């Protein structure tokens, strides 16, 4: 019924997914004209393929089209984006240009595809979620995540209110006509505040004895337990479930995964490997080395480091600028030589389109 509204949807795309709305609701909200969203269809479908066929898909947070491009050139199969739809659009433009540069230079395709799926952070209530989903679909995003926190510490929203938001995003995907992936994130591991205790599913985790904050928020007992409950409640309304964590731990990841799987067998999971966590201090080399592999086997099929690009950029430029300050051109020469050494690995920035365009014109 919904499969005909979403012509590019693969077989079994919506197995286990519940919608608040109806097929007639989608048609009514659709307009009279069909507009194709090619990048979004392709991306969503490639991401759906990958998370079902690979041991796991890992991604890094990109700040720019060039960063995204290097990730794809390096062999990574997806892009994470942490202003959002604008960057997704910019990213898809530079990926398109990389593909076009290759084909115009007479070169074959050096990657699975230049259009690696983009999974983006949707940063209001349900009409906001609706509009943002649309924006990302227009931009060509493959998947979009929605978190149950409100824009001390983080403030959660009621379970029912997040479920409305997830439903609003599915409705937006349905109206656009794309099988766009929806990721539900819970912030309940570290969140100490909650807007309202109205939802009975949330009242078990309320620290009533702390009373309300001066601003009227409820105080909550954080940890894995409310994350499990929330994840279970969200499961029918998303494609992947994500528990935000600032303390990476395989045993806790396993605890979460098994608990979710009791209620929803085979449910696909997402995992953020925290860039703030001190990996080397807390985990031995062998644990660090196997971490993503072992998470993948638990059902964490989409894994990422949110601020990877940020850390890489800032650290790279600081070191560059420091050497340049003290040793001037010797510093840049070191970078250049490193770039040269990487060309064997597949680096191309040192080793055309507007030449081929020009010849076609004349």
């Amino acid at each position: 019924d919904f499969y005909s509204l979403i012509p590019s949807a693969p077989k079994g795309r919506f197995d286990g997914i519940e919608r608040a709305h109806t097929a007639e609701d989608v048609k009514r909200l659709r307009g009279s004209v069909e507009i194709k969203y090619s990048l979004a269809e392709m991306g969503a479908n490639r991401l759906w393929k990958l998370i079902h066929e690979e041991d796991f898909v890992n991604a890094l947070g990109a700040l720019s089209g060039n960063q995204a491009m290097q990730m794809v050139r390096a062999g990574l199969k997806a892009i994470y984006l942490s202003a959002g739809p604008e960057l997704a659009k910019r990213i898809n433009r530079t990926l398109q240009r990389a593909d076009q540069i290759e084909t115009a230079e007479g070169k074959g395709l050096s990657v699975d595809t230049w259009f690696a799926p983009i999974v983006a952070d949707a940063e209001g209530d349900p009409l906001d979620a609706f509009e943002i989903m649309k924006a990302y679909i227009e931009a060509g995003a493959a998947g979009v995540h929605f978190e149950d926190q409100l824009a001390g510490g983080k403030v959660l929203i009621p379970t029912a209110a997040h479920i409305r938001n997830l439903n609003a995003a599915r409705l937006a995907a349905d109206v656009m006509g794309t099988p766009t992936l929806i990721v539900a994130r819970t912030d309940a591991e570290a969140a100490k505040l909650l807007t309202s205790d109205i939802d009975e599913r949330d009242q078990p985790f309320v620290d009533y004895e702390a009373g309300r904050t001066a601003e009227g928020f409820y105080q909550v007992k954080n940890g894995i337990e409310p994350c499990i409950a929330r994840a279970i409640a969200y499961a029918p309304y998303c494609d992947l479930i994500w528990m935000e964590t600032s303390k990476p731990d395989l045993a806790q990841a396993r605890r979460f995964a098994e608990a979710v799987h009791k209620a929803h067998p085979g449910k696909l999971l997402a995992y953020n490997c925290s860039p703030s966590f001190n990996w080397k201090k807390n985990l031995d080399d062998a644990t660090i080395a196997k971490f993503q592999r072992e998470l993948g086997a638990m059902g964490y099929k989409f894994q990422f480091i949110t601020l990877a690009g940020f850390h890489q950029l800032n650290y790279g430029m600081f070191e560059l600028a420091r050497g340049y300050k003290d040793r001037q051109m010797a510093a840049y020469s070191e970078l250049q030589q490193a770039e040269f050494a990487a060309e064997a690995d597949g680096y191309t920035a040192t080793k055309g389109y507007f030449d081929a365009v020009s010849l076609a014109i004349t």
Copy 2:
């Protein structure tokens, strides 16, 4: 074969059109993926239909999505506009989409033939810029773009250079895969300068006895004759030919169409009905009344007033503000009463998100 590269192109769309490049050139520049540009395909095909079926298509320059929407509301069949251009084209289309979505959701049918009236846009450096600007307009959902032969008194570029711009625009449209209309505009009626006498076709109009100017420009005999020569040369590289004029003159317009039609019978033409020309002072009431109808019969199938939105916006607000200053709310109530009175004629600017909310909260 170019019809395979542009699958929405109607039969005979490219009769009489010459391309400097090949189908293989298109493939090499397109890349490995086919992105659909639905609104661009729709707009181009609708404009193509309109100019072959209507006595003529007349448009007004829109400055905003709302102005454009009112044009379509009132029964106009096309929109004119002059990176801000593509952004405006994108905005107009968003506003048109909304109007369509609102009326679809109301389930009473549409109040218009279609909300997606074709947009014809002004592409006002070289042929690579023409290529990129055409790409941007197609992404925006524009139906036609015009390219002029003046360097941005006026200074012409060589005939060969403009043909390169025109072909680059066609190349762009072929790569995107859309049958976008190209309008060639000549500024030779008034222009007395030319960048270079390189082209044999321009040389007969060069005043060699006079020097180059201090800027190095060639001096050139202006008027209808160079307009005719350039039009005839441009004709195979565009879909409509447009001679710019400062003086609206039915006799000259007939002279131009006849000369162009000598070389290319049935060639479709466009005409700007100058907003800066004082119509009532220089033309009698009957000539004004028949002006556009007369042009249509000569082959001017696309006609427009470039700054119509600008003058309408500025005058209306001046007068409102003058009344508001003088008599406060009385002045606004008069506007409001005029809006109600207009409702009989299809005015509506005195729902959808309500129906969205409803769909979410099921």
Copy 3:
């Protein structure tokens, strides 16, 4: 002492104004550099002057730089507008600057008191958003910003929360170093919901016998009484108080001003003259004629029609396009003749860069 931190602030600018923060708080947040915000200083100081010197200042909502320019051209003394907001404020000011530059270069004197009419703008999440949005508007050159107490039927936030928004906006203005006007708007006349009953000042209006709603909102007695209570509480944290109304009513407006003035004599007020209200149908011609003058005498020193530009734009283009469809150039010539006729009253939209070129080519 805050006058040192805001050097353009006129004498007594801050009489009766309370700040939750200190001068030292301002210094720590300002940083080591003092950036000048000339248009913001000018606008704020001019608005401050106008509202203390004029019977009242009345404005219309502008949608573009050109609309705003026509308002000033026609003799209006201020502009109303509702990240798009700050961008529009910046655009309006650019257009005003140009108008000023054009007339200065013509060396005949200006046709207005000043081109830089104060802009009052709508700041439509929390107090940090209010802080950032105020900063953006000040950079844009806005003179005043309004902040409302509804969550973006309507749902109120607690009285204490809005005071935090208001103070954050003041903090923002102090940090930027500008005497920007803050308008507090209350939506309590119509609002029946409240996010939290945390604040003792709101509790007397809460219907405790009714539950919370399904979303967790408190149900609340609406009307002028909670408007009065909130206004009085907001008064020390703003420069003008604004009660939102859907029904224009001189008697209620007097009732509100009198009650507010009980607590804070001489408090300046603002009033939106609703565009959606049917004026002629619900008010007699004399009441309409006197409406704004009457409000001014009660202390409503800033009055505005929020959507005036929208209705004027949409109606004018609808009618133009209707005439154009029917009679082509005749319809435009009529507009043009109306523009010429208006020139007598100071209309000019029927030079500078010429004088620039001249200066370059010496």
Copy 4:
């Protein structure tokens, strides 16, 4: 005479500078209102200070505000920028935020100033130069470079036409009221084409025997010689002279400098150290190490690597993504540990403002 129009201008700022226009031209084009451009005044004045007091100022090309910020944090005294004014604005925003973070965290100033001068590439004829200069002054740029090429290979414009552009930029700086630095760049070392031979200063370097290209351009004999002539012609119309070079060579840099100094003793020079040139292959370690120092002594007081940020970003992310592909978290851990090791050097991204703002509010 001009010093009073530019109140922040230091003593001797305009020694040796010729203007086509007059002080009265500036006043006429100024408007009636004075708008301060604090970042532009400060930046231009700090850059003027530095290039006169330091052995040389070296800079790297920044792609983003964060890159710029790390450069400043590393101790570099200026920023190079190679969409432009928008990025300069973004850069100045993130530099302001770094300063504000420090002061709000109770920390002293860890750098000379966070507002390191920005020198930017101005990427039309003289009215374009005028408008771009203004845009950059608004954005807070310290200096702006204008090149004598037109938007096979590069095409030069006549000497007179570039001089018009330089004059247009000075007029824009004069009208804005800022002592903004102007850099004249010549592209004559590698450029093989020229739009027109109209200027007798250019005719000595025209390869008449090659004839005109099919597009009408003249062919030119490139190298140091036409660079010297052009630089000498531009000298009175700029603050720094820059010869674009793709082959770094001290002897040639010296030849250029001495030749310019014969005509204009003490003239300040700029130099781009090419990122495409293979440093290690062509120069020995000792030459690489002294390169900038020795250039500085020749009068090259502003030196830069145009695409440094681009190369750093692309290379950094490629290597990151490669290790991550093959070793997952081990790769990120290596980056993190390197970030930790750099904190001793002054790196802070791993080791607040919206906390201090929040406390001030409440």
